[PDB]
Design an enzyme around this catalytic site. Structure first.
Site, PDB file in Angstrom:
ATOM      1  N   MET A 160       0.836  -1.189   0.000  1.00 13.81           N
ATOM      2  CA  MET A 160       0.000   0.000   0.000  1.00 13.81           C
ATOM      3  C   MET A 160       0.881   1.253   0.000  1.00 13.81           C
ATOM      4  O   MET A 160       0.695   2.179   0.814  1.00 13.81           O
ATOM      5  CB  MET A 160      -0.996  -0.004   1.163  1.00 13.81           C
ATOM      6  CG  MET A 160      -0.367   0.076   2.521  1.00 13.81           C
ATOM      7  SD  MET A 160      -1.652  -0.491   3.640  1.00 13.81           S
ATOM      8  CE  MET A 160      -0.666  -0.730   5.126  1.00 13.81           C
ATOM      9  N   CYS A 162       1.160   3.993  -1.554  1.00 15.41           N
ATOM     10  CA  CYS A 162       0.682   5.368  -1.545  1.00 15.41           C
ATOM     11  C   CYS A 162       0.319   5.827  -0.136  1.00 15.41           C
ATOM     12  O   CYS A 162       0.568   6.986   0.227  1.00 15.41           O
ATOM     13  CB  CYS A 162      -0.505   5.571  -2.474  1.00 15.41           C
ATOM     14  SG  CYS A 162      -0.070   5.348  -4.221  1.00 15.41           S
ATOM     15  N   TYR A 163      -0.291   4.915   0.630  1.00 17.48           N
ATOM     16  CA  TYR A 163      -0.773   5.167   1.979  1.00 17.48           C
ATOM     17  C   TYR A 163       0.414   5.311   2.935  1.00 17.48           C
ATOM     18  O   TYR A 163       0.473   6.277   3.695  1.00 17.48           O
ATOM     19  CB  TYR A 163      -1.687   4.016   2.438  1.00 17.48           C
ATOM     20  CG  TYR A 163      -2.112   4.111   3.896  1.00 17.48           C
ATOM     21  CD1 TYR A 163      -3.202   4.893   4.278  1.00 17.48           C
ATOM     22  CD2 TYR A 163      -1.430   3.405   4.882  1.00 17.48           C
ATOM     23  CE1 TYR A 163      -3.583   4.999   5.606  1.00 17.48           C
ATOM     24  CE2 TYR A 163      -1.804   3.506   6.216  1.00 17.48           C
ATOM     25  CZ  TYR A 163      -2.877   4.304   6.577  1.00 17.48           C
ATOM     26  OH  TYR A 163      -3.229   4.384   7.896  1.00 17.48           O
ATOM     27  N   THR A 164       1.352   4.359   2.859  1.00 17.61           N
ATOM     28  CA  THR A 164       2.505   4.328   3.755  1.00 17.61           C
ATOM     29  C   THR A 164       3.382   5.548   3.459  1.00 17.61           C
ATOM     30  O   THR A 164       3.880   6.172   4.387  1.00 17.61           O
ATOM     31  CB  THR A 164       3.262   3.000   3.682  1.00 17.61           C
ATOM     32  OG1 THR A 164       3.584   2.754   2.315  1.00 17.61           O
ATOM     33  CG2 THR A 164       2.489   1.831   4.269  1.00 17.61           C
TER      34      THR A 164
END
Ligand SMILES: O=S(=O)(O)C[C@H]1O[C@@H](O)[C@H](O)[C@@H](O)[C@@H]1O
Ligand SMILES: O=S(=O)(O)C[C@H]1O[C@@H](O)[C@H](O)[C@@H](O)[C@@H]1O
Lengths: 255, 257, 257, 255
Positions: A160, A162-164
């Site tokens: 993930m 983009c989130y991290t």
């Protein structure tokens, strides 16, 4: 209303009457923030894309809650939401940049469009929200910002990006904002949860056990754990704390 | 070529013939990387917006250097540059995500457009460059990525929110990419410089600001591009084969004050 | 008792009746802890070398305060103090390892004896106090430990190697003890102050050094003992039940420069 | 001698002739340091309690190796060992504080005697060794110190409190020493290994697999990995690096 969780029995006098703004406020962790601050006699505005969940929560909490529909991707609406809060209640006292999307995604599958949208949803708004609240805070000579961080990037969690990456970005933005705005009385810290049990999260039992086995404290964290930390970081009891992370993770990040 | 800075007297046999790709390669720190790896007998491709600077440097370095014009904001061109390197020389061995813009800007003044473009210039390309090199690396079963970090966010330096925020983002992306790709043989670390004397950074006054760095640093001398390049060579070579997910800070102590 | 600093207007119901044990409790930061928890209706035991200061403070605070004379270097006395607290009030709920000596000393001059004693005064007791409280905590299935850290080592402050090294040691001990004891319900964190105005720290000149802290800090005011106590109460209460292994820094930004 | 591992094919000209001192030098990681620097044409002194292992290694490496028997607990002998190195070869160029004891021990079982001895064996010597080499380094205006750290305390590893605590302590001592001594030309960093396969370590197969599964890079690290890092941290190629950790752990610390 006694059907809505107060989250703590602690009482923070310094929170009464304070203007609190929370993004992604209508579900999960954000909802718990909204409830907890309301229960402390704050005036709490929240932003969310989900209008029916938003209005139901505001209905449950009453007139010290204010629900504003807002797609945080839309910075123009975000700045209007802020302006509206200011006009109703005055300068924001506490901002919690909470809105985020943690949809899983493989490195090879990310397109340019997906990357940009994820960054707009997970990072960009936190900056603009801070930029919007800041001048009013500075006029008063006080205010508090809490950026919702995540131990995911700390633990180098795959799947993930983009989130991290957004979360990691907020880690830095906290430090530089603390310096940029500290001279104006504004403190900025990051609240950094571990694996929080919510409705939206989820073999569920199995995954929950794996968190307990990995954690140092052998119980599951929930939204209340986050809100208890938030109240402290908002209150005058943390007046001297800025630029810092506060990690509520039962030890999950240290393995 | 006889007049070129080699940056170090060290010799890394494992660097010979390796395919090295560097963004913002035509000037400053990027140029130093290009020179240093060339001097180790690597095959070095570099990307830069400045076509004339790029072509002159590749002409000076010779046939083991390849300059591709590229605006890193343009992901389509970025991916075409990568594919062209792959066709010339095969899978990239070492990627250095170096391109960046550290122009000062006031928090209060940043617009939506400025924010987006600064993020595209400082962050986005590093992810897509990684994504482009990865499949070829994985086919071979080996590769190294170096993300240029900065101590600026660590020191919570004000006055360039977009740059410091992008740099902090790379700190996280290093760790998650290290995990996501390590199963394929790819290692990923961040080279994190302090205050590097370069032509741009330069442009008392200068003297006074330079002295303040020395006074704030633990070691009392100015770091330069060569200091960064020496670190890069180590992080690219087989001598750092087991290192991944990590920062390596070359800052003479500026971040610890 | 009507003249006592309560430190905060906050009320933590979960603190009522809890057994709190604090080393170096009779003056400065330790005294502030003792006052603050007493004001929350905790049962507070404190250890200190200064018998007259200790007894006067316990006399001022009343019957929910218990002063035990203790040289923390003396592990045997330390363990006897703990056992006596346990017999009076039951298992400790909150331990605060606060006792320390930050006297300045030159690297080059430190002898073997000075090193050992400084380590015993600053580090050793925190481990043994933890070891003493642990069994009773575990029997109940709950407890909290707070190790007083310092930003000094983080900022690589020179001129007190033994103190900064002990503080860095506590940073690690927090994390491993958090894991080792968490299975028993015990949480362990470090409270990490910046530059705290106290009577000792005080003892322009003073004014000038105080201004330099304000100029270096992000928030432009001096922190005091109350700032530490407010943090301690949170870390002791049920509002931090899920927090363990972690630092919480109260430093007005002094460590980020 | 071609029976002794050179550890790397890299050649560091700046290492030739340099005076290197390594504690716990006669086995495992310390032995690998000794071999690697010898192979770079350094003059390498090493300290160890094991006299027969010490002398065998010095015999294998030849006259650019110097074995000094030393119990690092004994600071008086430690300072004599340093003085002897100085008299033979001049001021130390590179110090590697490597000697340590990682015997496992439960929190409840540690006595005051065991704690003190473990601290003397794992921490105290690193400080005194640094104090001994420093004045000679300063006279020259250059030198390098490498403190062997460990990811154990970072990952909050239970069951060896004295070892993990000493290691954590060295993390701080690196930063303050870097400041204290930097003005004299001396750089100090910490080399921080992950789970290194050695002879002394160790169902062995099973435990080795668990490290691979936990690591980001799917192979076992060995002593060579440490020595390669050490050479870089000693050479002029790291001249601008001080106060810092360098972690060689295949990602084990980020989980
Ligand atoms: O002075 S720091 O900001 O602490 C370190 C340096 O980081 C660089 O990435 C900046 O572009 C420099 O302008 C800056 O000097
Ligand atoms: O100034 S720092 O060393 O960064 C912070 C403070 O840490 C304390 O533990 C010291 O005892 C103080 O004397 C010092 O001011």
């Amino acid at each position: 209303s006694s059907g809505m969780n107060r989250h703590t029995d602690t009482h923070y006098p310094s929170l009464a009457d304070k203007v609190v703004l929370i993004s992604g406020g209508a579900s999960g962790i954000g909802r718990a923030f909204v409830e907890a601050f309301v229960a402390q006699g704050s005036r709490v505005a929240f932003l969310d894309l989900d209008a029916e969940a938003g209005q139901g929560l505001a209905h449950a909490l009453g007139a010290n809650s204010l629900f504003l529909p807002c797609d945080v991707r839309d910075i123009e609406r975000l700045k209007a939401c802020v302006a509206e809060v200011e006009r109703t209640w005055g300068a924001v006292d506490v901002l919690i940049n909470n809105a985020a999307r943690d949809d899983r995604h493989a490195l090879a599958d990310v397109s340019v469009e997906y990357w940009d949208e994820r960054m707009q949803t997970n990072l960009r708004h936190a900056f603009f929200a801070a930029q919007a609240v800041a001048p009013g805070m500075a006029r008063r000579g006080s205010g508090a910002i809490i950026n919702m961080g995540s131990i995911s990037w700390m633990r180098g969690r795959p799947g993930m990006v983009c989130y991290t990456t957004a979360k990691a970005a907020l880690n830095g933005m906290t430090r530089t904002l603390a310096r940029e705005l500290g001279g104006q009385g504004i403190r900025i810290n990051s609240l950094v949860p571990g694996a929080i049990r919510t409705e939206r999260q989820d073999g569920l039992e199995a995954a929950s056990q794996a968190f307990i086995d990995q954690q140092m404290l052998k119980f599951r964290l929930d939204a209340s754990d986050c809100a208890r930390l938030a109240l402290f970081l908002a209150s005058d009891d943390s007046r001297g704390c800025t630029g810092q992370n506060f990690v509520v993770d039962a030890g999950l990040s240290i393995q």
